[PDB]
TrEMBL record:
Residues shown, of full length: 978 to 1025 of 1997
Protein known as: Mastigoneme-like protein
Length: 38
């Protein structure tokens, strides 16, 4: 505690289920023009 020489676990505990990451789904909201007739 406080201030890791001694290991409390014998082996390192790995997560059973592999985490499946998903790519970003970014999209274009809108397009505006400042000087415009319409």
């Amino acid at each position: 505690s406080a201030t890791t020489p001694s290991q409390l676990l014998a082996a390192v505990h790995s997560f059973a289920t592999p985490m499946v990451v998903a790519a970003a789904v970014v999209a274009v909201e809108s397009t505006t023009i400042s000087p415009n007739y319409n």
